Structure formats: structure tokens, C-alpha cells
């Protein structure tokens, strides 16, 4: 019964998920002056040309755009990563106001939203096995700021009315996630965790420096979603972000000078 309310929000999660107070929790604040350039990192390889989206689901905490992850069709490689990571889903975190919503922060700055493209390491066979490993997942995080619209987001925004409430899904084929990426792949990377329960410490985070712009109208549509199920009291799906956690014994590395 975790969520983002007063009585069940991030500050409560540790009671059911003690790993919430662990050594490599996410998100974190990215202190840009203390991140260090690492010349031995590579460029990221983001290979989404064969991506096969299937469905969009309101799971009660966010909406997930799900992919076919039964072959190496949309993969992330390179950067800090060893081996091949398959795209399974993406989702967002966002605020009630444009001044908050991101999970990671940059010099304490909060963005209006944050996109998470979730990938699992093929050496572990399935997502469920991958999340039990320290190098199981790679999550590409992309900040959203409010300004110009993102044309490649509009197909997502337009289906949201059909998945208003928890448990609703809709077919969502032929969506191209390349239309959600910024121009630059410059990034920061560090070892962390899922940002939702069970908070497993299985993620190599790759957070892009360049935000994407979305319009106020696009984010407004996110904010019409509901945390509740149909026929339950309406609670808008807003402020579905975990705040920054202690960095502890971690260094954030930069791919760029």
C-alpha cells in the first residue's frame, strides 16, 4: 500500500522496504561541479530502430509504455555498460506544478518531469532475474522542461484519456521512442536503485544532461490521470516522484568535459 500521499509516501517506504535506507538508493542530486569527467566511458549506443511498442498501462503510480522484449530489438549498450540491455518499458514522473516533478536534480534544480527508459541486462534472461543483480538494469533518464511541445510525445498524451484510472491499459503499437530523445547523448552515470518499491539496488543510471522541452498542454494532460481505480474517489496522479537520496559512498561520472 505504498504511494505518494501523506500517509504512504516516500518517507514511509522504509517500513515495508528497508532497502530504502540502503547504500545505493536513487534518485540523487547531481552536483555538476563534483561529477568527474571520465575519459574511459563510451558514447552511449541507443539502438531503437526496431523497437516494438505493444501497450500502455496505468499501474496506479505512473503509466508504462511497454515493449516486446523477447528479442534484441531496442537496446542500450556502451557508455558505462558491459554487454546489452533490452528496453522493456518507459514511464515518467511529474509534478503538480512546473517547478517540481523530476526525481534526479541537477545542482538542486528540479525539472517539471523525468522520463525513465528501463532496460534489462540480457545476460540474466528476464527482467525478474535482472532486478536481483547489481548490474541488472540500465535506466536512461531524461529531464523534461516546459516550453515548446515535443511532437514525438503527442501520441502518448492523446491516449491518456483511455487509461485514466489504475488498471486500465490500451493497445499502443508502432510508437517510436526515438522521438523522445534530446539531440545530445552527453550524460552522468552512477550506480543506484529502482526509485519505486521494491527499491532494488540493481540499476546503472544514465542521466542525460540535455532536457527535452514539452508544452504546458502536454504536461497538463499527464496531470489529468488518476492514481485511483474507476469508481473510486478521484485522486489526480501528480507528484509521483521520490526525492533525492543520500549519495553515500558513490561518485557520479560525466561523459563530457
- Minimum CB separation of residue 37 from Zn ion in Å reads 26
1 among annotated binding-site residues = no
The CA angle 212-217-221, to the nearest 5 degrees, is: 95
Q: Which residue has the cell 492523446?
A: 158
| Cell numbers representing residue 194 in the block | 529502482
Question: CA-CA distance, 193 to 27, in Å (whole number)?
Answer: 8
Element (H, E) at 222: helix 216-222
Q: In terms of CB distance, is 37 or 181 closer to Zn ion?
A: 181
- Minimum CB separation of residue 207 from Zn ion in Å reads 12
195 among annotated binding-site residues = yes
DSSP for 114-161, please give it: EEEEEEEEGGGSSHHHHTTSTTSEEEEEEEEEESS--GGGHHHHHHGG
Q: In terms of CB distance, is 38 or 243 closer to Zn ion?
A: 243
- Minimum CB separation of residue 116 from Zn ion in Å reads 4
Q: Write out the residues near Zn ion by the rule CB under 5 A.
A: 116
| Chain centre to alpha carbon of residue 144 | 11
- Minimum CB separation of residue 191 from Zn ion in Å reads 16
Q: In terms of CB distance, is 116 or 150 closer to Zn ion?
A: 116
196 among annotated binding-site residues = yes
Element (H, E) at 221: helix 216-222
Whether the CB-CB separation of 240 and 172 falls below 8 Å is answered with: no
Q: In terms of CB distance, is 37 or 212 closer to Zn ion?
A: 212
The catalytic residues are: 61
116 among annotated binding-site residues = yes
- Minimum CB separation of residue 158 from Zn ion in Å reads 22
Whether the CB-CB separation of 152 and 142 falls below 8 Å is answered with: no
Question: CA-CA distance, 153 to 156, in Å (whole number)?
Answer: 5
Q: In terms of CB distance, is 116 or 221 closer to Zn ion?
A: 116
Whether the CB-CB separation of 201 and 19 falls below 8 Å is answered with: yes
Element (H, E) at 217: helix 216-222
Binding residues for substrate: 195-196
Task: Return binding residues for Zn(2+).
Answer: 91, 93, 116
Amino acid at each position: 500500500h505504498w504511494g505518494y500521499g501523506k500517509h504512504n509516501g516516500p518517507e514511509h517506504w522504509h517500513k515495508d522496504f528497508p532497502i530504502a535506507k540502503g547504500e545505493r538508493q536513487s534518485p540523487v542530486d547531481i552536483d555538476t561541479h563534483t561529477a568527474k569527467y571520465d575519459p574511459s566511458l563510451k558514447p552511449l549506443s541507443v539502438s531503437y530502430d526496431q523497437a516494438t511498442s505493444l501497450r500502455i498501462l496505468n499501474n496506479g503510480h505512473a503509466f508504462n509504455v511497454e515493449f516486446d522484449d523477447s528479442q534484441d530489438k531496442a537496446v542500450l549498450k556502451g557508455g558505462p555498460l558491459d554487454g546489452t540491455y533490452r528496453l522493456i518499458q518507459f514511464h515518467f514522473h511529474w509534478g503538480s506544478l512546473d517547478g517540481q516533478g523530476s526525481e534526479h536534480t541537477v545542482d538542486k534544480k528540479k525539472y517539471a518531469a523525468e522520463l525513465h527508459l528501463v532496460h534489462w541486462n540480457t545476460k540474466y534472461g528476464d527482467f525478474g532475474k535482472a532486478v536481483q543483480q547489481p548490474d541488472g538494469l540500465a535506466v536512461l533518464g531524461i529531464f523534461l522542461k516546459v516550453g515548446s511541445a515535443k511532437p514525438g510525445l503527442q501520441k502518448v498524451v492523446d491516449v491518456l484519456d483511455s487509461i485514466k484510472t489504475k488498471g486500465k491499459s490500451a493497445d499502443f503499437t508502432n510508437f517510436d521512442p526515438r522521438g523522445l530523445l534530446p539531440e545530445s547523448l552527453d550524460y552522468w552515470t552512477y550506480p543506484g536503485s529502482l526509485t519505486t518499491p521494491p527499491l532494488l539496488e540493481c540499476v546503472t543510471w544514465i542521466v542525460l544532461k540535455e532536457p527535452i522541452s514539452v508544452s504546458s498542454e502536454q504536461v497538463l494532460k499527464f496531470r489529468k490521470l488518476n492514481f485511483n481505480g474507476e469508481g473510486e474517489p478521484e485522486e489526480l496522479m501528480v507528484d509521483n516522484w521520490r526525492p533525492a537520496q543520500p549519495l553515500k559512498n558513490r561518485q557520479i561520472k560525466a561523459s563530457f568535459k
